Amino acid sequence: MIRDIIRMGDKRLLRVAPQVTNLGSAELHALVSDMFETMGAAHGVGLAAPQIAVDLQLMVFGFPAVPLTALANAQIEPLSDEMENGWEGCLSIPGLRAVIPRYRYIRYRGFAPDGSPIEREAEGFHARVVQHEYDHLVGRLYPSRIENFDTFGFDDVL
Amino acid sequence: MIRDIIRMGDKRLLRVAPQVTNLGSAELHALVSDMFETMGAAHGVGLAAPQIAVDLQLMVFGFPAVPLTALANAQIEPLSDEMENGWEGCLSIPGLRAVIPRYRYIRYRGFAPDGSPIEREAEGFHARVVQHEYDHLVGRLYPSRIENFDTFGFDDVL
Numbered sequence: 001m002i003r004d005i006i007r008m009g010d011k012r013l014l015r016v017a018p019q020v021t022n023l024g025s026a027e028l029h030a031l032v033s034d035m036f037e038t039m040g041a042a043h044g045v046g047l048a049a050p051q052i053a054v055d056l057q058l059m060v061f062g063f064p065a066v067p068l069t070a071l072a073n074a075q076i077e078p079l080s081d082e083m084e085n086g087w088e089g090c091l092s093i094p095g096l097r098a099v100i101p102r103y104r105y106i107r108y109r110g111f112a113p114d115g116s117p118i119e120r121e122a123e124g125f126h127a128r129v130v131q132h133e134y135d136h137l138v139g140r141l142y143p144s145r146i147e148n149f150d151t152f153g154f155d156d157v158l
Numbered sequence: 159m160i161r162d163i164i165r166m167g168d169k170r171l172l173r174v175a176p177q178v179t180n181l182g183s184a185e186l187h188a189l190v191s192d193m194f195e196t197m198g199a200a201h202g203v204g205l206a207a208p209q210i211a212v213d214l215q216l217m218v219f220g221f222p223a224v225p226l227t228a229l230a231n232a233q234i235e236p237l238s239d240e241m242e243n244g245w246e247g248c249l250s251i252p253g254l255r256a257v258i259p260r261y262r263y264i265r266y267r268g269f270a271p272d273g274s275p276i277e278r279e280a281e282g283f284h285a286r287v288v289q290h291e292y293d294h295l296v297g298r299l300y301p302s303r304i305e306n307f308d309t310f311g312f313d314d315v316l
């Protein structure tokens with residue numbers, strides 16, 4: 001079932017989401033299913049549970065190919081100090097883009113929907129997507145990370 | 159003649175505009191006329207010449223009533239350190255609002271389109287409008303002035 005994506009300005013995007021505690025459940029599987037569907041319909045490369053007003057530490061992503069992944073209770077460690085700029089837009093902020101600095105190299109850990117542990121090293125785009133979806137789980141959006149405001153503008157214009 | 163308002167992301171909104179040097183001219187009067195018209199059609203309380211891709215130190219405004227004013231070669235002095243928060247949206251950024259801190263009290267100086275000198279003390283909303291239009295003449299947009307990003311979001315949602 002495709003879900004309504006909520007837009008910036010909604011308080012539910014500013015929460016810090018609790019953990020998933022129903023790994024392996026039919027409810028979690030249905031919810032993840034919906035997230036993949038909602039992501040594909042909206043043409044995103046990532047989607048975070050709060051964007052559909054589900055207050056859960058949960059994200060999906062996949063697209064430099066990134067594997068199709070569902071990740072619960074994500075935690076993230078930078079593997080170095082190196083930052084990299086790249087373009088981002090948020091489906092909660094349709095039409096806009098900015099250049100965002102992110103870690104070039106990360107580790108991420110959590111759980112696949114069935115309970116399998118996931119741990120991966122990621123770089124570049126793969127790392128960016130995960131850092132972006134992570135920010136949602138802690139009530140953080142990309143505009144508060146913009147350093148150069150000349151780069152912030154509408155996609156069709158920029 | 160109503161003018162197309164250009165949107166954030168356009169480089170022409172990032173310029174520092176030169177001075178008006180044709181006070182009292184038919185060309186300036188036509189341009190100001192157009193600005194008042196474009197402002198009214200877009201339902202704004204202010205409009206700055208760069209927003210219609212005219213690279214000129216020129217703004218219009220008027221709406222706590224603010225008088226209907228056309229102001230060329232504006233310069234602005236704070237009359238105190240006191241800041242005040244208020245909501246703003248920009249016709250170059252349709253749909254969005256944020257809370258922006260501005261001086262509560264200003265002086266502004268320039269010229270009416272016919273050459274008459276204008277100097278005024280302004281406070282609160284009147285002062286905000288002028289500070290906002292001023293920022294456009296120096297390539298500055300409100301998002302780079304946001305302090306609390308929780309307040310940045312879409313009008314219909316916020």
Ligand SMILES: CCCCC[C@H](CC(=O)NO)C(=O)N[C@H](C(=O)N1CCC[C@H]1CO)C(C)C
Nearest residue numbers: 043044045046047048087088089090091129132
């Ligand atoms: C890149 C950081 C990950 C962004 C995630 C968003 C989706 C989203 O809002 N997730 O929470 C997305 O798919 N955004 C895309 C995006 O920003 N892209 C697509 C490819 C490159 C990059 C900038 O263009 C498009 C739909 C705007």
Ligand SMILES: CCCCC[C@H](CC(=O)NO)C(=O)N[C@H](C(=O)N1CCC[C@H]1CO)C(C)C
Nearest residue numbers: 201202203204205206245246247248249287290
């Ligand atoms: C308040 C600072 C002046 C903003 C000027 C803008 C117009 C603009 O983009 N000028 O350069 C406007 O009219 N914005 C309005 C606006 O921000 N308003 C209308 C009244 C109160 C305030 C916030 O709601 C509406 C159309 C979004």
